[PDB]
């Protein structure tokens, strides 16, 4: 079987939320998660006297410091009889001996399980920060839930009494609802994304056309973050002084294809923000005796005999997306 | 007898379907196509205990897989009479060369080939998204029928009840239509390609040309279709969570011109949609003599002696346009 | 007398009807013009069985394939007594050489010769795409008639019915009047070529400047090939997803110059339609002798003796400016 | 033990007021503060006939000179139990490295370190520019207070029978109310900074949002100076020949936020102001050894014993941020 070093991939495709937030990654060397050995915040400095005295600074953790990682671990088998997809600059010539096809097929397995894993991932962090709170759930896993312990006063409800869908579309300036939606945001907002159907109802208001920017961006690198995703990211421009972004991901259930995000829905936040990507443990007996338990990803290829004489791979892993201060971003649950 | 590296075309033109939906490609190592060899698509990364065994993701295909595919093999003169196009000066004294003129007229002759092998990939294409069937038919060709797995809820007939036409083109609103025949899709849906007049009268509704926004930088990199495919697609503007293509394609029959969509039909559809381009084996005695028995295009220069004593040259392949989720689709019949 | 390889102008300049519509050119090797030799289209296919053979592909779809080109050959008198443009610090006393002077005239006389082939052929365009019918008569020239084959429902003009001049200038909205006229043009349209004075009344109505995007720089790239003639073609913008440019060029008779178009004119067409560029032979001695008997351009300098005793420069052409689909413009005469 | 020469840092995240006011720095070898030492300003020039000798110029600067800066001293330990943070593409080899690990530590205390002194060299900016009194507190410090000789009038707080809360929102022009305050500034203003919490009152003004030019783009270098701190300040606009900036950033107390201007306040000055950065003794006894008794800050690692058994690194130094025309900014208190 190949041997760990079949791990040239060295992709950064990571969507939107992964790369704009949760930036900084702290992977663990235990079972679990604990919040005590993140660095967390800076204190004030606290004048003190001269060299008379001095007092040692200790950064704790507040109250929770234990959760559970997301340990995933999906299989796939490495058959070789399934037809290879035409990639360009393939000569069938060189590819229909086995030492070729069965070396391809493994990458290729590597490929889509780092792909899912990844949006899983993804998942996971949209779950995380469009309402404070998640869970995780799953066959033969037993249910674990997540509070990041977000403020109520952070996700409005447009729905109650006063939405955007129900006045002129020629006369009413969204831009006092922005202010008043941004201003429970614990530092100023840039970043302000929208959902595919969520944008239209905010776009229809004259108002915002002539002022809203359309110039190429003259924010940040973010355009360059955002090229690169040219499928599903779109940037729009400049609202006077924050960036406006419009995303329609897709994830793949069981048979369907769903957004992450709930339809009618926005958010406003920074582009600076802390979002932790912590890690746990790879559990396995490989991984601990080669000193790679503090790891985010693990592959494995190995060949099983006997009752499943077949050879399989695997990409184990143990998100735990978290966020250091939930109350920097606004839901928006518009109607 | 030229060589069998004359296939330097490089021409990505494919038009609108080979390109939106079955951008994924598979040519084939047998005669038939097997459908259950595909990979297929990827579920999220279901979370299991690691002290469980995992389940294997397997490519579980459907009840039938035994596909025939539609063998295809134009063939050409290559008689030095046609004349040829001035490319900008390209020195016109080597015009007169024959050995020059028949090596220039073989790429225009290709080109040729391959455009005349482009449309039948879509005319299947537009059948198996507009109907979920196809048949295979021609002369000295046994009639083959292709059932993809379609079911009633996406084939609407507007004509059944209450139809668009015999409204008040003033008052009446079709989002609620549209929001029910997107219902029964099986995923996100965001392109509605019409018709080149079964768009004039959706338009026609006054609340539509409201709503629609024909700005341009509109939703996503698709308006490259437009830049690319400037002579049969336009792109009317966005509609929401679904964008306006209006795709006015032709293909021509032995003398005659006629247009790949009937005249009043839309598709709910959506852009990651994947669509498979499963290609059969290059049945030719001297195709499998190099080892090109499993390839998309197949071209052979050759001459014939005897009773034809002229030379010609062929492009054989096999397409067989198949879709992995035939019902991530609705057809909707409008009157 | 000066070699026949001075012919340095590579200088083209072709007027928005030779560079948008009539890029592709097709030089004969007859006399006449024979459409029938043009490619022109292509079947789709035939579904044949892998065993049989298929039938030969020919190259049919045209019928009358018989034309008289429009030659073309005027001359000037090189005398070295004429005034010149002096160039800014690079003709101290070279001027005063009689050779070199001479030379600088012949390239000059060259410059003003191409012009005097541009207009007629521009004209030849504008006769093509405004009616489909062109008249080719002058004195020392037979008169003789080329039809390109448009149908008369493609040359509507606006008198019959409600003209735009009888009409509100304030609220309503010429889009559906432009999408009326545009269904009867086989295939998608882009570009509505204006007369300033014809564009004036539409350029009036409150909706047009309320969606004409007039920013520019658009995703349109027509206007990198506009620029180039900025003297006569400005570029109006998008209107949604077709482009709006105004074109005023006049081209000079005798003393005169005359306007291209007539004044209450417009026209419907894609950037992307195929344009003949087909010249005829130059009947010539001197150019069968040295066999430039198929070619666009051909200079002659040579000196007169008795009579009238001088040098003189012909260059000689054959344009018969040609349309593949005639029926793909539409001609609307505005009032 | 690290080496003395190990202060790697060269960040320069100063927060829009030690980087627009306070520029110039003037450390201190003596314990006090003596104001009377600073340049100042300088005479005209005292015209003098060119055989007479002139008098020397001598300028001494300031009168009230006994001041007292605090002695912030910050420790860290170093206890090698923190999951360091992963570096983006490092390997996991060196991680087992103890040595390796011990620096990255070192390497983050310093950043926590530095982080912690400039928010008391930007909560002393704040208390100087919002009032021109400033006391220093804190456990063992004997709290010691800072006049920095303001005026009266220059404190104007809206609290009359008109305020910018309870007046019309549509017709009060504040253009007026703004240069009444910015009359008794000393000078021509510049910097109309607001609290976002009073900035959104501001805004609702329409007489603001017409004349308000927020084009992208502040003056061409105060958002080149600006955009380091994408999380605390914003840029508005241009409100004619003054600029508009939204400071927001927070100081955080031992276990909480707070904001360092009152909600409802604005305050006034220019960018070319100049604000003393005046330092003190750094009163170490390695430091006197090394010759580093002035200096603005002065790292420190040591490894105790017994009782505190631990490794510490500490950095200590002593702001009293001054300025030299505290009348020239005038902090209004809005209602």
Same mark, same amino acid.
């Given at each position: 079987a190949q041997l760990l070093a079949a791990n040239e991939q060295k992709f950064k495709f990571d969507p939107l939320f992964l790369r704009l937030f949760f930036?900084?990654?702290?992977?663990?060397?235990?079972?679990?998660?604990? $919040?005590?050995?993140? *660095?967390? &915040? +800076?204190?004030?400095?606290?004048? +003190?006297?001269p060299i008379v005295s001095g007092e040692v600074i200790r950064s704790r953790g507040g109250s929770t410091s234990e959760f559970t990682p997301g340990y995933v671990k999906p299989k796939?088998? @490495?058959?070789?009889?399934?037809? $290879?997809?035409?990639?360009?600059?393939?000569? *069938?010539?060189?590819?229909?001996?086995?030492?070729?096809? !069965? !070396?391809?097929?493994?990458m290729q397995n590597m490929r889509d399980e780092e792909l899912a894993i990844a949006q899983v991932e993804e998942m996971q962090a949209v779950s995380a920060v469009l309402k404070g709170k998640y869970t995780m759930t799953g066959e033969?896993?037993? *249910?674990?839930? @997540?509070?990041?312990?977000?403020?109520?006063?952070?996700?409005?409800?447009?729905s109650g009494g006063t939405e955007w869908s129900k006045r002129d579309k020629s006369t009413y300036d969204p831009t006092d609802d922005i202010e008043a939606y941004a201003l429970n945001a614990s530092g100023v907002v840039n970043i302000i994304v929208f959902d595919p159907k969520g944008w239209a109802l905010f776009r229809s208001f004259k108002a915002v056309k002539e002022k809203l920017d359309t110039r190429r961006g003259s924010n940040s690198? $973010?355009?360059?973050? +955002?090229?690169?995703?040219?499928?599903?990211?779109?940037?729009?421009?400049?609202?006077?002084? @924050?960036?406006? +972004?419009?995303?329609?991901?897709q994830y793949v259930e069981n048979g369907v294809k769903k957004n992450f995000l709930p339809d009618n829905t926005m958010v406003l936040g920074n582009t600076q923000a802390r979002g932790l990507r912590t890690y746990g443990c790879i559990q396995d007996a490989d991984a601990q005796r080669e000193g790679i338990n503090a790891s985010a990803r693990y592959p494995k290829n190995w060949v099983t005999t006997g009752d499943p004489a077949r050879e399989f791979t695997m990409i184990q892993?143990? *998100? &735990?997306?978290?966020?250091?201060?939930?109350d920097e971003f606004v839901s928006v649950q518009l109607a």
């Open positions: 930036r900084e990654s702290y992977p663990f060397t235990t079972e679990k998660v604990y $919040l005590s050995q993140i *660095p967390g &915040l +800076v204190n004030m400095a606290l004048y +003190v006297s796939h088998e @490495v058959n070789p009889q399934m037809t $290879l997809r035409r990639l360009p600059d393939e000569d *069938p010539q060189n590819l229909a001996d086995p030492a070729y096809r !069965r !070396r391809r097929i493994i033969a896993f037993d *249910p674990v839930e @997540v509070d990041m312990g977000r403020s109520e006063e952070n996700n409005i409800t447009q690198e $973010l355009e360059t973050a +955002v090229k690169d995703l040219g499928k599903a990211v779109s940037y729009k421009g400049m609202y006077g002084d @924050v960036a406006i +972004v419009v995303y329609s991901g892993s143990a *998100p &735990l997306m978290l966020l250091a201060d939930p």
